Design a protein around this nucleic acid. Structure first.
Lengths: 94, 48, 109, 138, 193
RNA sequence: AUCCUUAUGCACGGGAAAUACGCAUAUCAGUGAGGAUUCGUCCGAGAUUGUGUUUUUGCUGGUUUAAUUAUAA
């Protein structure tokens, strides 16, 4: 995705860029009836706030030095054994 | 059920079967699709 | 692992003798076709499954054999007769002999 | 999400759509504060690597670059669109709008059958792919 | 530093969530205590949500308020997972707290039978003799009853054709297979999961 | 000098399987891999982990007519 690394624009409008194909006064008083209209008028985060805070003491070495992950359930092994054992079928003898 | 539907012909009038223009149907066999389908399952096929 | 690519391939067709016997397994028998053919206009033969639910065997008996209920001997393919996996095979045979020497220890005593 | 790369420019867009040679291009148009534009973002998040051979996935907020809105007629929070060799791929879902996509697909396996099915269709040049699944009632 | 580590952090969100799907206690060293705590609390939340959701859907499926579809499917899984969890629990605590009969009760019970049978004049079942007139006239019965799952099937999957193999061999070389049985009875006390 | 034996190699004939086989600078492994039981013992070489193919490897099989040119004027 180098053009995600480059990310220049050019002077060009996107549409032709590919050759693309499609296959104040009244608004003023309108705003008056808008702000007028509204004139008559989380918990989760709050929970974890303590712990996400208590991480304040965590050294960035431990951030650097941390395991990444593993597989405890052996998802691969059993998995590939399934999608192995089912590979083929057969015909039921006559 | 057949008779109470008016006998075979009155059914087949509901079909294309005249289209294949066999004179009378009395010699013919169908082809279960399940056979064709299965016979295509022993191959190697994406879930789609 | 990435799903390979959807695109179909030109079929390699190699049919030896050997390779054929290895095919006869996966390809429907003859009989197994004479099921599928449903005689038009006339109710199937069906049988009752384990569950009593009816398995149609449609033409598997030539209509002369329906009148007499002759079932079929016709052709029985020995090609697709199911056979053990490698591993399981030796667990079977192995356990058999082992049990047999245990037995013969009840043979002489 | 982190797997899914994103677009910041209409320039990114049309370069991408041009610059993926051999495989499908998938783009979500949706606004981060949308509900589905989270959900669907997840569904696609789980399929990214698994399809990476024959297609590729990108996220684009209308709010980021709203250019295409006029030209592709973007309503709804989330519309996925599929492009292969710069052509707009059209797979009738029976939903009544054959172009593009709207709603939420709830099955991985489904979604894959779509990305695939369309792909295989687009490799032959057929403009119409006919979905495996008519979800129309949506 | 963030982004690279951020991803993996997401992983242990997953492998957390799985390892709770599995009951596995899920311990890693090098995982700083506070984070691990965080994960815990998280899994409690998503957990309770997931469970309550499962039971919630369920009863609806019994009444029939439109469930969509994938809820009908996944529901069975995301549920049976539990029923296993409950079972594993009841048996944990039938290790810890030991059997619930207490011997006194058992004496009455066992007595009851023993009296019954004596009263009934009943001889126990002999272990089958190595020559038992009915052996063949039996095996066939039992063998057919492993046969008839299949008698419809057109396409044997893998595990099947393995069985149907055995059923045919023992159905062929009986005297051997009988011997294999009788041994299994007389000894084997261990079994495959 | 002849034979047998053993293993290995080149072969020839014949059968069998192709849910089998690989591969791996992996990791361990007679300094015990793994298993069993009649609970005294007995057995004693691969297992793990990842990975690739596996309705297959190579090949070979049958159906959807050239240019040159001749009259007496």
């Amino acid at each position: 995705p180098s053009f995600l690394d480059q990310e220049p624009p050019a002077g060009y409008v996107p549409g032709i860029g590919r050759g693309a194909t499609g296959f104040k006064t009244l608004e003023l008083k309108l705003a008056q009836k808008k702000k007028k209209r509204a004139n008559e008028k989380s918990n989760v985060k709050r929970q974890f706030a303590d712990l996400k805070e208590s991480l304040a003491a965590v050294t960035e070495s431990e951030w650097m030095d941390i395991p990444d992950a593993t597989d405890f359930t052996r998802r691969n092994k059993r998995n590939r054994i399934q999608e192995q054992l089912n590979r083929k079928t057969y015909a039921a003898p006559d | 059920v057949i008779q109470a539907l008016g006998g075979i012909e009155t059914i087949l009038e509901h079909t294309l079967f005249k289209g294949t223009g066999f004179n009378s149907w009395e010699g013919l066999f169908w082809e279960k699709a399940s056979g064709f389908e299965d016979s295509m399952q022993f191959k190697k096929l994406t879930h789609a | 692992k990435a799903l390979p690519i959807p695109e179909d391939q030109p079929k390699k067709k190699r049919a030896g003798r050997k390779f054929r016997k290895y095919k006869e397994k996966f390809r429907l028998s003859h009989v197994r076709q004479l099921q599928n053919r449903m005689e038009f206009g006339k109710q199937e033969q069906t049988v009752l499954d384990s569950y009593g639910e009816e398995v149609g065997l449609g033409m598997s008996n030539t209509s002369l054999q329906q009148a007499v209920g002759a079932t079929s001997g016709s052709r029985r393919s020995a090609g697709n007769q199911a056979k053990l996996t490698k591993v399981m095979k030796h667990r079977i045979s192995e356990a058999n002999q082992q049990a047999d020497e245990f037995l013969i220890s009840l043979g002489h005593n | 999400s982190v797997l899914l790369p994103q677009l910041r420019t209409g320039w990114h867009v049309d370069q991408a759509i041009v610059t993926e040679t051999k495989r499908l291009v998938v783009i979500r148009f949706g606004r981060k504060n949308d509900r589905q534009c989270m959900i669907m973002d997840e569904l696609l998040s789980s399929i990214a690597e698994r399809v990476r051979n024959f297609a590729v996935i990108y996220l684009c907020d209308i709010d980021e670059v709203s250019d295409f809105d006029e030209m592709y007629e973007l309503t709804d929070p989330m519309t996925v669109m599929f492009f292969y060799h710069n052509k707009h791929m059209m797979c009738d879902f029976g939903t009544g709008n054959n172009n593009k996509l709207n709603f939420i697909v709830d099955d991985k396996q489904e979604m894959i059958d779509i990305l695939e099915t369309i792909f295989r269709g687009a490799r032959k040049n057929k403009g119409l792919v006919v979905s495996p699944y008519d979800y129309n009632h949506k | 530093i963030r982004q690279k580590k951020a991803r993996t952090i997401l992983q242990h969100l997953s492998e957390a969530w799985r390892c709770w799907k599995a009951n596995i206690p899920w311990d890693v060293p090098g995982m700083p205590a506070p984070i691990k705590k965080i994960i815990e609390r998280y899994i409690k939340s998503k957990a309770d949500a997931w469970v309550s959701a499962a039971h919630y859907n369920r009863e609806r499926i019994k009444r029939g308020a439109h469930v969509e579809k994938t809820m009908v499917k996944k529901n069975l899984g995301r549920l049976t997972r539990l029923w296993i969890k409950n079972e594993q629990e009841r048996q944990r605590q039938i290790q810890k707290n030991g059997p619930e009969i207490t011997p006194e009760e058992a004496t009455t019970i066992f007595s009851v039978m023993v009296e019954w049978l004596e009263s009934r004049s009943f001889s126990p079942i002999p272990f089958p003799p190595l020559t038992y007139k009915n052996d063949t006239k039996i095996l066939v019965l039992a063998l057919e009853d492993l046969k008839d799952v299949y008698a419809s099937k057109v396409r044997l999957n893998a595990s099947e054709r393995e069985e149907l193999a055995l059923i045919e061999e023992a159905y062929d070389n009986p005297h051997d297979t009988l011997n294999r049985i009788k041994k299994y009875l007389l000894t084997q006390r261990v079994f495959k999961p």
